Each structure stands twice: as structure tokens, then as C-alpha cells.
Design a protein around this ligand. Structure first.
Ligand SMILES: *[C@@H]1O[C@H](CO)[C@@H](O[C@@H]2O[C@H](CO)[C@@H](O[C@@H]3O[C@H](CO)[C@@H](O)[C@H](O)[C@@H]3O)[C@H](O)[C@H]2NC(C)=O)[C@H](O)[C@H]1NC(C)=O
Ligand SMILES: *[C@@H]1O[C@H](CO)[C@@H](O[C@@H]2O[C@H](CO)[C@@H](O[C@@H]3O[C@H](CO)[C@@H](O)[C@H](O)[C@@H]3O)[C@H](O)[C@H]2NC(C)=O)[C@H](O)[C@H]1NC(C)=O
Lengths: 49, 262, 49, 52, 52
């Protein structure tokens, strides 16, 4: 779940596949501007720490 | 030698406020700050790469920075990084800088111009380092234990890290149009520019020479410099050129490493 | 801890870009209409809207 | 293992040696962008921009 | 506190300091520090530089 321990999971350090559930969303750019906005729940490993 | 920095160029991006609360397109814009070392060192990304000259030669005194699709040079002194207090610069290479800072709520970086003007950028960043162990000391003692920790080293060897680079987009500019009398003139100097004028028959394309349309005014033409010879960066503040992307890679200096602290 | 990767945006002048899906962890893509970005030298995209 | 249109050369010795960037930067970077997925990318990066 | 100071004509520093509790808070419902690159516009007030 996003924002908690295990928001991203990987089966091993070297494993190629990754599970990510972080609630990433995009938003429109403000007029006359080029910047790719987004809002996205902060990390759950940092939160757990 | 090797000199990867001869295919890469400094760029101009957007800074939300440039030390005065106002926004402008600045040559010292701050990309991600990385703080994944236990001793509490930071890695800031400039947009102006520091340690190389205009003429692409290595130098410890000159730093490269963009100035209106023209690369200029600044002195390594006057590079200031700060938070609530004032930081100590440990490392210096390319886009990246290393520093140790007092706790604060923002940080800004600044350099001199060629005209000796301060150019800066500050971002909101919550810095509150905590030393490793079970005590929240500030300065190391003359008598204590050694506990393992990690930092960024000053080696600039092969690193196993990435930056994506790509060709810069065609930068628009309007200072190259001159209207004399019913005719337009486009300036030159070694830069091939694209033009698109809605005056008469087909008169679009790229050029390396002056011409006169002899038909319409400057309300219809524009100039987009297409400097297309060297990589810039994959930054969210500058557009891409082509739909499926092109991409590249460059290693970054200062890898993470194991040490002990007292 | 994760890392959000955000490429540079793609702007088409008098065109439309069609959203392309791909297999990335927690991938997000959108297309927004009517942008008029400005850069330091001026505003490109002659095309008004 | 690196590829140039219809060349398929070993990445140690691209056919532009010496001074690939100096002779033509445009083509060197256009070719070097096409090989980002290949594992021998960094050897080609080393060999493309090294000359005296 | 705050102080204002300047060099003298004989190149000496002259300063004056007063006790002043400064704690500004931005207009809105968040106590931010630096303006972002993406947000809202809220009315506020300022002192202009006109001398009319
Ligand atoms: C700081 O030191 C620690 C302790 O050595 C480092 O952790 C260890 O790093 C080594 C790196 O070679 C890891 O070895 C690896 O082991 C796997 C086993 O499957 C092997 O397949 C790999 O090829 C590699 O040899 C080791 O596992 C790892 N963890 C330990 C020893 O518990 C740490 O990376 C260091 N931090 C740095 C250098 O920033
Ligand atoms: C140079 O600038 C002009 C703008 O003055 C560009 O012309 C514009 O081109 C687009 C795409 O061809 C036109 O959109 C089209 O609109 C018609 C409706 O009239 C529609 O049927 C098409 O499917 C398409 O949506 C646009 O109208 C046109 N602008 C004008 C004023 O006619 C031109 O593309 C630019 N040249 C280059 C090389 O970029």
C-alpha cells in the first residue's frame, strides 16, 4: 500500500521485476510554461525508518 | 585523454525564485538533491557544469555556464552554497557538487556572471542530519569510539550510475529579425536557423545566410536556432525534440562508499 | 526508497500526440491540449492554440 | 556488437577511428544514441571520443 | 532583533540594533518557505517601488 512499509516490493536485490504502488498522478502544466507537474505519496521505507 | 565533457553542454532551465522571490530562466538551476549518505553530505545538481573551460579544456578555476545559446565562463571562486547558515564545499565535478550544511529549511547556490553579477537559485529543502549511533552530538571528540558509516568519495572513475542526455530542442529567439523597409533580415555567424513565414508561396526551411523576403513584416517570421551537435540533459524543464526519444548515458562522479566516524 | 523518473515533455506544434502505453512500474501518461509554452528567447509554436 | 545502419561492427573499433567526434560530431552522436540498449554501450562511448 | 549599518566617510562601520520579533507567515493555509513551480494564486499585499 502507498505511504507504508512495502509500497514498492522486489523479490531480490538483483530481481528485474518490481511492484510499485505509490499513487503517482499527473496534472496540467500552468499556462505559458513547460514543467510536468505531479503529486505522489512520499516513500514508505523513509516513513517506516 | 577521455574527456566525456566534450559532448555535453550547459543549459538554461526554470528556477521558481532566484534569491529575490521572483522567477526567471536561470543558468544555475537546481535539479535533485541527494542525501543518501550517513554522515550528512549532499549532492546537488547544477545546470552549469563546473571544472571545464569554454574551450573544453579541464581547469580547476573556470566553470561553464549557458548564456543565451552561447557558452560563457566564470571563476571557481564565488561559488556559494548555503542554507540557514553557510556550507563547506567538499567536491566539485561537472553538474555535481558536494557540501556539508547546517540544518535549515531551504538551500541556494550562486555564482558570479561574466559581468560580475550574482546568479542564484534557492529551493525548499528540509535538511536535518542526525549522526549515527545513540547520541546526537554535533562535533567529533578527541576521544571516542569508531562506528561504521557511509559518504560520497571524491573519485571520478567508472561509477556505475546514469544520466540520460539528449539533443537540445530548437531554441526560439526573436532578436534575429530586423525590418528595414518592407523586407526582413536574419542575422548569421555560424548558427543555422529555421524559419516559417506565412508570406506568399513556400518560404520555410533552414538557413545559414541572410535574406530579404521583400514582402511582409516581422509579424510572420521567426527564428529557432537548431544547435544539434552536442548533448544537453533529460530535464523536465526543457522540451524534447522527437516523439520516440533518442537518449544517451553519462556516468556521474562521487560514488557512495564505506568509512568510519568517531 | 524509490525514485520517480520524469523525462522531458514532448510538445507538438499544430499536432496531436497519441498516448502510448508501456510496461513500467506504476507508469503514468497523459496528453494536454492547448498549451502555449514560453522559453527564454520567446514563445515557440507559431500555432496559436 | 554495435550497429551502424548495415555495418554490425565490434564496439572496440568503430569505423570512424580516429577522432570520431572531431571528424563528424553529428553522426557520432546519432550513432551512439542508437546503441543505448546494447551492453557494450560504454566501450563504444570510450572509443567514440578518444583521440590525439 | 535587527540592525542597520554602513561604512563611515573614514571607512568605519556605524550600526544600530533594535529588538524586533520577526516571524512572517504566508497567506493561505500552509506555512511554506519558498514558492513552488506549481500552485495557486492567492491575493496578498506588498510595498511597491513607485514614488508617485
Ligand atoms: C559497505 O560494506 C558492506 C559490507 O561489506 C557492503 O555490503 C556488502 O556489499 C557486497 C558488495 O560486493 C555484497 O557482496 C555481494 O554478495 C552477493 C551475494 O549474493 C554476490 O552475488 C555479489 O556479487 C556481491 O559480491 C554483500 O552482499 C553486501 N552485504 C553484506 C556483506 O552483508 C556495502 O555494500 C558497503 N557499502 C558501500 C560500499 O557503499
Ligand atoms: C508554419 O506555421 C504554420 C502556421 O501559420 C503551420 O501551418 C499550420 O499547419 C497545421 C497542420 O498542417 C494546420 O492545422 C490544420 O488545420 C486544418 C483546418 O484548416 C485541418 O484540416 C488539418 O487537419 C490541420 O489540423 C494549421 O491550420 C496551419 N496553420 C495555418 C494558419 O494554416 C505550419 O505547419 C508551419 N510549418 C512547419 C514546417 O511547422
Amino acid at each position: 500500500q502507498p505511504g507504508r512499509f512495502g509500497d514498492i516490493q522486489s523479490r531480490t536485490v538483483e530481481s528485474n521485476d518490481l511492484y510499485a504502488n505509490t499513487a503517482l498522478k499527473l496534472a496540467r502544466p500552468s499556462p505559458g510554461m513547460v514543467h510536468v507537474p505531479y503529486t505522489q505519496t512520499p516513500s514508505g521505507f523513509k516513513y517506516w525508518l | 585523454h577521455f574527456n566525456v565533457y566534450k559532448a555535453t553542454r550547459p543549459y538554461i532551465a526554470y528556477c521558481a525564485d532566484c534569491g529575490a522571490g521572483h522567477s526567471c530562466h536561470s543558468p544555475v538551476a537546481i535539479e535533485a538533491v541527494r542525501s543518501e549518505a550517513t554522515d550528512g553530505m549532499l549532492k546537488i545538481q547544477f545546470s552549469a557544469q563546473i571544472g571545464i573551460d569554454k574551450s573544453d579544456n579541464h581547469d580547476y578555476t573556470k566553470i561553464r555556464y549557458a548564456d543565451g545559446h552561447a557558452i560563457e565562463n566564470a571563476v571557481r571562486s564565488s561559488l556559494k552554497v548555503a542554507t540557514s547558515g553557510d556550507c563547506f564545499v567538499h567536491g566539485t565535478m561537472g553538474h555535481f557538487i558536494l557540501a556539508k550544511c547546517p540544518p535549515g529549511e531551504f538551500l541556494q547556490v550562486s555564482i558570479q556572471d561574466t559581468r560580475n553579477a550574482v546568479r542564484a537559485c534557492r529551493i525548499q529543502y528540509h535538511h536535518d542530519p542526525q549522526p549515527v549511533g545513540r547520541e546526537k552530538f554535533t562535533i567529533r571528540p578527541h576521544y571516542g569510539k569508531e562506528i561504521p558509516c557511509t559518504t560520497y568519495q571524491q573519485t571520478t572513475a567508472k561509477t556505475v550510475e546514469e544520466i540520460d542526455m539528449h539533443m537540445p530542442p530548437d531554441t526560439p529567439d526573436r532578436t534575429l529579425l530586423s525590418q528595414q523597409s518592407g523586407n526582413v533580415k536574419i542575422t548569421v555567424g555560424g548558427k543555422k536557423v529555421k524559419y516559417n513565414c506565412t508570406c506568399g508561396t513556400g518560404n520555410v526551411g533552414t538557413t545559414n545566410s541572410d535574406m530579404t523576403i521583400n514582402t511582409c513584416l516581422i509579424e510572420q517570421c521567426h527564428v529557432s536556432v537548431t544547435d544539434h551537435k552536442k548533448w544537453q540533459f533529460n530535464s523536465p524543464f526543457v522540451p524534447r525534440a522527437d516523439e520516440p526519444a533518442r537518449k544517451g548515458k553519462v556516468h556521474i562522479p562521487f560514488p557512495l562508499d564505506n568509512i568510519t566516524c568517531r | 526508497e524509490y525514485k520517480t523518473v520524469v523525462p522531458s515533455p514532448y510538445v507538438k506544434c499544430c499536432g496531436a500526440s497519441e498516448c502510448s502505453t508501456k510496461e513500467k512500474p506504476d507508469y503514468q501518461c497523459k496528453v494536454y491540449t492547448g498549451v502555449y509554452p514560453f522559453m527564454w528567447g520567446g514563445a515557440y509554436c507559431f500555432c496559436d492554440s | 556488437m554495435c550497429v551502424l545502419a548495415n555495418a554490425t561492427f565490434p564496439c572496440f573499433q568503430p569505423p570512424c577511428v580516429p577522432c570520431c567526434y572531431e571528424n563528424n560530431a553529428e553522426a557520432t552522436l546519432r550513432m551512439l544514441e542508437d546503441n543505448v540498449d546494447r551492453p557494450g554501450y560504454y566501450d563504444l562511448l570510450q572509443a567514440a571520443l578518444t583521440c590525439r
